[PDB]
A paper describes a structure:
The Hydroxycarboxylic acid receptor 2 (HCA2), also known as the niacin receptor or GPR109A, is a prototypical GPCR that plays a central role in the inhibition of lipolytic and atherogenic activities. Upon activation by agonists, GPR109A couples to Gαi sub-family of heterotrimeric G-proteins leading to lowering of cAMP response. Here, we present five different cryo-EM structures of GPR109A-G-protein complexes where the receptor is activated either by niacin, acipimox, MK6892, GSK256073, or MMF. The comparison of the ligand binding pocket in all five structures reveals that R1113.36 forms the most important residue for binding to the negatively charged carboxyl group of ligands, niacin, acipimox, MK6892, GSK256073 and MMF through hydrogen bond.
GSK256073 was reported to display robust specificity for GPR109A over the other hydroxycarboxylic acid receptor subtypes, maintain the ability to lower the levels of non-esterified fatty acids in pre-clinical animal studies with reduced flushing response, and even promising outcomes in healthy male subjects. In the case of GSK256073, we observed a higher response in G-protein dissociation but similar efficacy in cAMP response, and it also displayed higher efficacy in βarr recruitment as compared to niacin. Three more pairs of hydrogen bonds can be observed, one between the carboxyl moiety of niacin (or acipimox, GSK256073 and MMF) with the side chain Y2847.43, two between the chloride moiety of GSK256073 with the side chain S179ECL2 and backbone N-atom of F180ECL2 and one between oxo-group at position 4 of MMF with S179ECL2. Similarly, hydrophobic residues such as L1043.29, L1073.32, F2777.36, and L2807.39 forms extensive interactions with GSK256073. Although niacin, acipimox and GSK256073 exhibit hydrophilic, hydrophobic, and charged properties that largely match with those of the ligand binding pocket, slight conformational variation can be observed within the binding pocket for the niacin or acipimox and GSK256073 complexes. These conformational shifts can be attributed to the presence of the extra Cl moiety in GSK256073. We also observed that unlike other agonists, MK6892 is able to activate G-protein-coupling to R1113.36A mutant as measured using cAMP response although it fails to elicit measurable βarr recruitment. On the other hand, stimulation of S179ECL2A mutant with GSK256073 results in a robust enhancement in cAMP response as well as a modest augmentation of βarr recruitment compared to the wild-type receptor. However, GSK256073 is relatively more efficacious and potent in βarr recruitment assay while MK6892 is weaker than niacin in the βarr recruitment assay.
Numbering used by the authors:
A (entry chain C): 3 to 340
B (entry chain R): 9 to 55, 58 to 301
C (entry chain G): 8 to 62
D (entry chain B): 6 to 49, 183 to 230, 245 to 354
E (entry chain H): 1 to 120, 136 to 247
Write the structure that this text describes.
Amino acid sequence: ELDQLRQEAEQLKNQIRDARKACADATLSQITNNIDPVGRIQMRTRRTLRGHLAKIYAMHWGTDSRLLVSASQDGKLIIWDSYTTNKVHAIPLRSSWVMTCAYAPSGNYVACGGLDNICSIYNLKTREGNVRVSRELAGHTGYLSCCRFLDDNQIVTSSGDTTCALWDIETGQQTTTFTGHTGDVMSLSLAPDTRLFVSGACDASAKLWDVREGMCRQTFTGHESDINAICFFPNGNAFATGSDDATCRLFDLRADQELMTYSHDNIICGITSVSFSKSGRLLLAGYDDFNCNVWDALKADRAGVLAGHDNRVSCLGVTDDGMAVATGSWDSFLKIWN
Amino acid sequence: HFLEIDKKNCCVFRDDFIVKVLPPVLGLEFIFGLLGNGLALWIFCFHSWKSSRIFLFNLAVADFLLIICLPFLMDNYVRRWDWKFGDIPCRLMLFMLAMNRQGSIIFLTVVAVDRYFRVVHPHHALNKISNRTAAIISCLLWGITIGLTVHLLKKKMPIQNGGANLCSSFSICHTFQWHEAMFLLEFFLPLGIILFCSARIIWSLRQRQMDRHAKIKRAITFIMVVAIVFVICFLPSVVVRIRIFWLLHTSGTQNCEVYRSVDLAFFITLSFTYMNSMLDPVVYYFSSPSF
Amino acid sequence: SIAQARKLVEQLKMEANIDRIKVSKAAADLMAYCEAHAKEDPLLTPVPASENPFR
Amino acid sequence: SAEERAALERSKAIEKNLKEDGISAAKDVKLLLLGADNSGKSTITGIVETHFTFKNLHFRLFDVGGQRSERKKWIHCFEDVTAIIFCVDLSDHESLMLFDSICNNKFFIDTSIILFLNKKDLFGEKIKKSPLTICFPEYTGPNTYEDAAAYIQAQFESKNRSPNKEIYCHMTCATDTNNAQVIFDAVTDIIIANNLRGCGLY
Amino acid sequence: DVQLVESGGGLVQPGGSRKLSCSASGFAFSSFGMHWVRQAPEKGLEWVAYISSGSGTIYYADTVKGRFTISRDDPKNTLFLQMTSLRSEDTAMYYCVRSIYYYGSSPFDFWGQGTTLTVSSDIVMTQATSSVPVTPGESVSISCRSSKSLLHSNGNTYLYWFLQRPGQSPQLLIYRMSNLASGVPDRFSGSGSGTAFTLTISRLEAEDVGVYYCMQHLEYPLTFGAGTKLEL
Ligand SMILES: CCCCCn1c(=O)[nH]c(=O)c2[nH]c(Cl)nc21
């Protein structure tokens, strides 16, 4: 009985392969060969937000494109005024082992989580002037790896226990739970319209989730090893994924298959962030080799190299205005590049 | 042979053996120090992240200034003490050496006391001072180098000694010999600090039986031989200067002819501090198996 | 295990039946979006000090 | 601007507070703690932090065994630990694969391991009833406490390959206070080694 | 709730001395600044003194500098104003005003109840109108002007608007001349630029009767306008 189900699943996967291959009437390069390159896109260090005591593990940009929140295993989530380097808040964490953070679109809330298996929703605009935990969201069986806000109330989270979940910070309960990965769900990225999101798992597969259905919609694959970071293309019809296999791939949602593979024989180090620029021409991948390598997303070749860290980069958040790209790193210096 | 300075009778010699013997020795020391310490500075500049590296940086820079200054010693002695460049080069030269030698000695002592705190009191907060604190303490030690020898710029020179113009401070005569008193002190007291630190570090390592590892056993050898090379380089010059003061005190004046051999020995053996300048890069450049 | 595999194959069918478009159309749409908005990205184009807040 | 200047004052107050907290934290020593299930750790839901003080040091021990996830994805957090305390239930000896994995992990080639063989008395009594061949068929020697203990001790240390680290094996009967002294002096040797490394001399 | 209460008022002989204290509760007093603002018995507000967080910086009004001294006991959540050589002009009700400064912060957001104390080159702020009779349902307008342009080069314009209801302490309504204060209805709206500012009230209700003071924060000492009475 079980063997019949396994055979039918194999037949279904074969049909997936056949249908995906039939639609591949061209490659991205075969069309983009008529397009001129961006040339040498050199970028330089404008500022350097010093002040973390240890390795920085996450950074996120406020929707106003000025405040940036950084989280480090020193146990402090500090909010930076990026135009003046002034530190605005120094939030003490209940545990030092933070691995992700998020800045709410309204700017009212700052999320934080890590090996605690608990996601803390800090409230910034408290009447008493201090910043205090609003909720301590709990229920994952493993470390919360990445979290993002859809609005001030409901936060989506991704955890090492092969699950992504959608919370309500108004009640602390899960409104919906997403399951289906085999490995740890290392990273997550919400689409620009927040109607749906993608997550990359340590089983080298990336999935498309629908927050209102509560179920998967499409599944993507193609890296040899775990996906470390993932981010939507700003048009909402594609997303880039960066694996530990020292390559970044661009997956089209409507074409249901990988379109391009950014890699270079000099590279052996794993990816750690795959954020785009606002026009989508530039994919500012960040590498464990201490460098951020800007790939021209359509010509599929290197546009430039950004360097300066004495240790691996942990984030490559691009401002919502496209004005600057921040790069936190394990040497505690969150440089601002523009 | 006579020279008069500060209304005091003094004696000076110009025996040809100086230009026969010194220039080859100081030239070999110049070659060794220039190559080794130049490559060390090159590494440190384009190939600092720690306070001990900051102290080694200060030592290497002082040695770099001194090695850059030696070719004027070359000229001076190939000229047989006929200092053609005159007043300002003479006084600037004399400071430069004085300041750079002392600085090299005091850093070396500071590196040894650093290793002391790093190995006998490993947890002590002095091991945790930031690079900025190292920079300010380096500036303070540089201030010590400057203030302890700044008088030598005020010393009037050069002095006509006959058919030549003498550029020198080590004139042999009784005076309030501040510079020569420093010369004595900079050996004896840093010798005490260096030897005390080295002895305590190798008795701390042996007491823990941690020399059971080969790398620690090599560390034992370095930490011991630093004092040995220091003594080999400086001891003969300072002990000869102590003789000079002994002979001046006992044998009296107006019979200077007998001191010629001992002055020859003094000048020729003094170049071992430059020999020290050649060998110092062993501390950092020619260092442990990371090198 | 049997019911779990049944759910797995049912999900595979539900994902298989989704609509799809030719890759040429997708790549053309991505290029059209990118080139339509190319003038408004301070990273791929240089920004003068008059506009740049990170001076 | 008379508004921005007060924000600048706020930034330099909280920067000072960050520096003071860092100075306070620098006195602690962070040790990772590992071992098999029920294997001696308890005698000596997420991360289980525990801490104690000895000779004015403030040791922090992390029992991370609660993480039901791949080591590879979170072990990089502990890259900065001073030492790894590894425990073995000697009365059992299946942990050798875990030791092999953790000793040569990409992040720990420079971090020394402290290795407590635990429940040694139960092992000695078991030797009077079962040969060491039962948990190690390859064993070739007499059935006695001292030789079997030395064998498994060398067997654990034989897993290291990198010369850049040391394994400080030790034995405990889980009925003595000597554990704190053993860890303190081992950590003191470890800190001296790290200091000599920092001087470019080790 | 956040609460501020001050004490130490009464009648003092001219030339005497008195200590006024401000007691805070329910908020992180150590991280807030504190100001003193005083009101003559039938006149608009006037500024007195400042003290920053952690006692780092202090400022005084020109009419007061040296006559008063301001200090705070952060662990006791108490601010002190020590006062000497009281002149006839020093009779006023004194309000304790909190403030906190960072990007996006709202200074002057909460005011104490005030203590009646009685005795036996700066930017000047001016309002073109003294009284405006108005009725509910209609819109209302109040306007204020400055001698110097408040729009600093960094883009902030530091005009502030306070509403004082009869028999009560002032409350913040508009800060930095465009932003709406926390907790105030949406009826109010600031506007203007440079040296002229306007506060617009849409669909007025009787709850908004009172005196509206414009204020600048571009430089110390801070200065209040004479106040426009929106009278029912
Ligand atoms: C200016 C030349 C004087 C010669 C004697 N002399 C000295 O007075 N100070 C020195 O530092 C030094 N080094 C060497 Cl070799 N000779 C030295």
